[PDB]
Amino acid sequence: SKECMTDGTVCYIHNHNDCCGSCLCSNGPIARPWEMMVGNCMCGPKA
């Protein structure tokens, strides 16, 4: 048996978080990090 999470749920490589999918970090443009910080990684489907 195995218990993991799906894409869309925040994950941390240094948080012993095990996600069935691979974490994808977005390097999008950062114009307003005060309200929208584009520097987080979440779980996603493997290609």
Curated annotation (Swiss-Prot):
Disulfide bonds join C4-C20, C11-C23, C19-C43, C25-C41. Residues 32-34 are annotated as: Keys region for toxin activity. The keyword Repeat does not apply. Keywords: Disulfide bond, Ion channel impairing toxin, Knottin, Neurotoxin, Secreted, Toxin, Voltage-gated sodium channel impairing toxin. One of its GO terms (cellular component) is extracellular region. The presence of a 'disulfide through disulfide knot' structurally defines this protein as a knottin. Belongs to the neurotoxin 16 (SFI) family. This is Mu-segestritoxin-Sf1a.
